[PDB]
Design a protein. Structure first.
Lengths: 48, 653, 278, 102
């Protein structure tokens, strides 16, 4: 292919590098989603 | 598009590489600008290729929406004189193309093969073939229906059972709960008897012939019953049957609008005429809908707005919204604002750009209902796309806004737009499930209910498990309907939670200590699972690719029926027939039996080889379409490869 | 026969004399009258509320003077809008604002006069700013016990108002009564200036006016230092060591974030040197 | 085919990229709403109050307190300080109607 299946992997590498980068940013969001739901449940605790 | 022409013209094969790429490109393409430009040059090289392929013209028919191009392709098929090969695009143009495109193609084509095209676009023969499918595959169970009947609750029971049996009784036209108890239906009053003549049109949906003379007992003009709300549902009853395609009943509605009941006739009358003219872009219906908008009455305001978005759907009428949103400021009622909220929302669909001009006005305004209008408007406009510009303001109104009802309708728009990729909804709506206010959780549960209804995803069932455990009563009810949409047509062999939820629906309703509110959606969750006798499903994503208008309009009106009870009886819009057909051609019914690898456990409605019709047709699950193989020993064998459902051609050897 | 759940449209002008005339009777209970227009069965509006003489001997049905209303309606004719009377209201500051024994005796009298005669109660005590409080009710006829006793259609506007269910004795009056939904028809014209008049008067009076130096920081350093050791002994208390003491315990708050904002107060107030001057 | 998915995979990439401002804008609002909820609990009960005598701490989130009139009252404690100022026997202020421990 030479355009190509060797280059497209490097193209797919960029996405997977950003996907892992996004997963790192997502991992930064995922544990931060807990800090919300926690305080969101604590926002229900003051209402409890 | 230059080098693309060389890539599609490359030698050898590439047998299907042009076929599935259009399915892949449609999903990954952000800008539709040059998308169809790639498609229009692709369908040309299909015809230039030696082997004709009719699945390519199916895709460009809806996307290019050119009435002059669709007229010339069949005009050649008329000269080609073979009705077998054109029989695929005959019903494909029917089930796929909307009412606006059907009215344009029917005119240029009809100007044998001329009589054959009449019933395909009007759906005449298409109703009866699936009318005979229902009565066969339908398996009635009266046990659970009686288990919810003996609660003996004076209210909320009259609305619950008549809408629950209409689920499993879809299209069978039979009369059962009317004949068995006369006195119990007489106990109903106010808007409850509105459903008796309404749910009568549900079970009778389809069957375009007898729908006139059978309901003559409920005629508002001649009978004039003591309760005025009983005679107001006769107009809305036939609108169900007459959704999309119309008929002679257009005069039947004209006779009952000018006599007897006023203005509650305009309630069921405009919804009956508006749903019948839905997609047709009719004029005279818009004329009498403006004076119904100015009647100033709050209850009739819903009928004026809801019927106006129907008829003008896809047309994008300028004067419609101008008279609607122009009346929204000085009106004193919320219900006129509601029907108008969906009214301006129903007219704008799938544009992705033009509708954004109104979206800026809706959400920015301080009217609580008009902010709900922006969410139903941005949903239908963005329906079928994952655009990141809509989710921006979607969360901002779902959080920063003080009103809880608009936060609900805000998260409900995620199920309308994202149904193409339902896997994304459980992730984005996850964090919204911990909201302290149950109003958001009611819509959060619905977002997984409406979007994932067709899918068999078990994760949505897992997320809906704590939803019915929440102390709030209506979030439990919202969890019952949503968890009933995920299991449609799916039995215990699919997911183990089936029998767990089925016993819970009858449990809570037979328990008097539980709230009457939540237990209304209990038996209704049964019926949702039993809808059409488990025969028919509801799918917004199909090979056709178009959204399903009556189910969305019906379920969005059924979101909150606590403002007006007819909105609970307007759930009758969610009832639609669907099936597959093995008919070869014309009126001749072939005898064909082919094997299936799935057990009767899926066929049970509370292996080596199976037996399927042989057109009445036989049932199939969307998951069972891949495991079935066309019979090699039959005299009648299909010329087209059989993969997904729908009516396909069958060639005689 | 046909009964639909009613929606009450209250005007921001009618909301005034509800709490204001109720405040004048505090602690004792007052007796008012609601003024509005009946549009239809399922909706109702109260466009005005006026004050009635408070009863120091206790509320009675004779506390309302008929010549007080006859002289008032005549003064409403020369006033912009002469709208017909609708119903009554009464304050109950001393308790959770529930219908008393006199309130039911004045029901059948007022519901004979006017069709609905919505019973409206209000209390000052339950909150100050961010709660609707107040109350409302409508008598469901006890003679209807022979007929269906569970109105209304279009339920949850009641059902949701049936939340929280407000303890026992309140909903103990749900026998022979049913409450009514209160929503606000938009006054936002007035409501926009209601926010502007409130916040501008609360923003430094000109925004200018408001815009113990080292000593306030010498008093703050006692909170920024002498409080540190009682705060920073707790991590040495988190060291057990190790481990016989019940854990976890989090002493991080609230002093840490207070001293943070304490600098935020002192830094931007010291910026007044750089901000105001030049 | 590999460029196909290569044009597919950046969707959920960018779909989660807009999901970054999704939560971050949502959580800060709710944070300010939670800070607004801090003013709520501090608003209650404001004034007036009544003196009462603490008896013993029976369990978490609630404790019994004798009223000045002598009648012992079992009251949910305030969620702020559950421990250090509790003490076995002390005079604690209570609200008029609710007799809330503050
Ligand atoms: Zn009183």
């Amino acid at each position: 292919l030479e355009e190509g299946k060797a280059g497209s992997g490097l193209r797919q590498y960029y996405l997977s590098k950003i996907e892992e980068l996004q997963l790192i940013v997502n991992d930064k969001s995922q544990n931060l989603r807990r800090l919300q739901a926690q305080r969101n449940e604590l926002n229900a605790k003051v209402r409890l | 598009l230059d080098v693309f022409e060389k890539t599609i013209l490359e030698s050898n094969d590439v047998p299907g590489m042009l076929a599935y790429s259009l399915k892949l490109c449609m999903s990954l393409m952000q800008n539709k600008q040059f998308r169809n430009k790639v498609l229009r040059v692709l369908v040309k090289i299909y015809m230039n290729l030696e082997k004709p392929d009719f699945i390519n013209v199916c895709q460009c028919l809806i996307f290019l929406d050119d009435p002059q191009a669709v007229s010339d392709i069949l005009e050649k098929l008329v000269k080609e004189d073979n009705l077998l090969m054109a029989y695929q695009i005959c019903f494909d143009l029917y089930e796929s193309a909307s009412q606006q495109f059907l009215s344009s193609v029917i005119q240029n084509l009809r100007t044998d093969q001329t009589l054959k095209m009449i019933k395909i676009l009007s759906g005449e023969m298409a109703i009866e073939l699936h009318l005979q499918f229902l009565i066969r595959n339908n398996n009635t169970d009266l046990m659970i229906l009686k288990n919810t009947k003996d609660a003996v609750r004076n209210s909320v029971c009259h609305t619950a059972t008549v809408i629950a049996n209409s689920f499993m009784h879809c299209g069978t036209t039979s009369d059962q709960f009317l004949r068995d108890n006369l006195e119990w239906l007489a106990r109903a009053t106010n808007w409850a008897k509105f459903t008796a003549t309404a749910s009568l049109g549900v079970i009778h949906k389809g069957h375009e012939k007898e729908a006139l003379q059978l309901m003559a007992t409920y005629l508002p003009k001649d009978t004039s019953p003591g309760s005025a709300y009983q005679e107001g549902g006769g107009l809305y009853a036939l609108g169900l049957i007459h959704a999309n395609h119309g008929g002679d009943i257009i005069d039947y509605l004209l006779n009952q609008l000018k006599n007897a009941s006023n203005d509650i006739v305009r309630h069921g009358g405009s919804l009956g005429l508006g749903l019948a003219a839905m997609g047709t872009a009719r004029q005279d219906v818009y004329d009498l809908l403006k004076t119904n908008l100015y009647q100033d009455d709050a209850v009739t305001g819903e009928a004026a707005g809801l019927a106006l978005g129907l008829v003008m759907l896809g047309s994008k009428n300028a004067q419609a919204i101008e008279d609607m949103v122009g009346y929204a400021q000085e009106t004193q009622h919320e219900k006129i604002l509601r029907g108008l909220a969906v009214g301006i929302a129903l007219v704008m669909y799938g544009r992705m750009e033009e509708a954004d001009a109104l979206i800026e006005s809706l959400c920015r305004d301080k009217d609580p209902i008009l902010r709900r209008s922006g969410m139903y408007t941005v949903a239908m406009a963005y329906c079928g796309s994952g655009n990141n510009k809509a989710i921006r303001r979607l969360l901002h109104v779902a959080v920063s806004d003080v009103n809880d009802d608009v936060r609900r309708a805000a998260v409900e728009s995620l199920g309308f737009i994202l149904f193409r990729t339902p896997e994304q909804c459980p992730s984005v709506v996850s964090l919204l499930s911990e909201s302290y206010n149950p109003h958001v959780r009611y819509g959060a549960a619905m977002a997984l209910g409406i979007c994932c209804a067709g899918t068999g995803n078990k994760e949505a069932i897992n997320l809906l498990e704590p939803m019915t455990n929440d102390p709030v009563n209506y979030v439990r009810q919202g969890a019952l309907i949503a968890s009933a949409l995920i299991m449609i047509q799916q039995t215990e062999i699919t997911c183990p939670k089936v029998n767990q939820f089925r016993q819970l629906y009858s449990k809570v309703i037979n328990d008097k200590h539980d709230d009457v509110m939540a237990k209304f959606g209990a038996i209704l969750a049964q019926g949702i699972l039993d809808a059409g006798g488990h025969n028919v499903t509801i799918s917004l994503q199909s090979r056709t690719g178009h959204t399903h208008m009556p189910s969305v309009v019906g379920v969005l009106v059924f979101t909150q029926f606590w403002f007006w009870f007819p909105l609970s009886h307007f759930l009758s819009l969610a009832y639609t027939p669907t099936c597959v057909i093995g008919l070869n051609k014309d009126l001749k019914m072939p005898k064909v039996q082919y094997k299936s690898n799935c057990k009767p456990s899926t066929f049970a409605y509370p292996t080596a080889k199976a037996k399927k019709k042989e057109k009445n047709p036989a049932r199939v699950m969307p998951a069972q379409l891949k495991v079935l193989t066309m019979p090699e020993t039959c005299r009648y064998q299909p010329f087209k490869p059989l993969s997904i459902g729908g009516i396909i051609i069958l060639k005689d050897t | 026969a046909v009964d639909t759940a009613e929606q009450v449209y209250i005007s921001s002008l009618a909301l005034l004399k509800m709490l204001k005339h109720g405040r004048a009777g505090v602690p004792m209970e007052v007796m008012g009258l609601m003024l509005g227009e009946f549009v239809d069965d399922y909706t109702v509006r109260v466009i005005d509320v006026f004050a009635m003489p408070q009863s120091g001997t206790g509320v009675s049905v004779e506390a309302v003077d008929p010549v007080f209303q006859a002289k008032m309606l005549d003064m409403l004719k020369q006033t912009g809008r002469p709208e017909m009377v609708v119903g009554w209201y009464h304050s109950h500051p001393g308790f959770g604002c529930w219908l008393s024994g006199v309130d039911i005796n004045t029901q059948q009298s007022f519901e004979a006069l006017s069709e609905r005669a919505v019973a409206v109660v209000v209390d000052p005590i339950q909150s100050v700013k961010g709660k609707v409080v107040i109350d409302a009710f409508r008598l469901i006829n006890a003679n209807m016990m022979v007929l269906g006793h569970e109105p209304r259609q279009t339920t949850s506007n009641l059902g949701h108002l049936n939340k929280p269910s407000i303890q026992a004795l309140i909903h103990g009056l749900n026998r022979h009564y049913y409450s009514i939904t209160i929503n606000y028809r938009k006054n936002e014209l007035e409501q926009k200036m209601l926010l502007n008049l409130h916040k501008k008067s609360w923003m430094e009076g000109l925004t200018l006016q408001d815009y113990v130096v080292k000593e306030m920081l010498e008093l703050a350093k006692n909170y920024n230092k002498a409080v540190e050791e009682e705060d920073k002994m707790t991590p040495e208390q988190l060291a057990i060591k190790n481990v016989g003491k019940q854990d976890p315990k989090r002493h991080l708050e609230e002093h840490v974030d207070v001293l943070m904002t304490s600098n935020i107060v002192q830094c931007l107030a010291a910026m007044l040197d750089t901000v105001v001057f030049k | 085919d590999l460029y196909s998915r290569y044009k597919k995979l950046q969707q959920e990439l960018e779909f989660l990229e807009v999901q970054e401002e999704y939560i971050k804008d949502e959580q800060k609002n709710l944070k300010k709403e939670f800070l607004h909820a801090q003013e709520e609990v501090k608003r209650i009960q404001s004034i007036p109050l009544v003196i009462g005598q603490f008896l013993e701490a029976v369990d978490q989130n609630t404790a019994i307190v004798g009223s000045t009139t002598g009648s012992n009252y079992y009251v949910r404690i305030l969620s702020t300080i559950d421990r250090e100022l509790l003490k076995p026997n002390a005079s604690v202020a209570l609200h008029k109607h609710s007799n809330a421990l503050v």
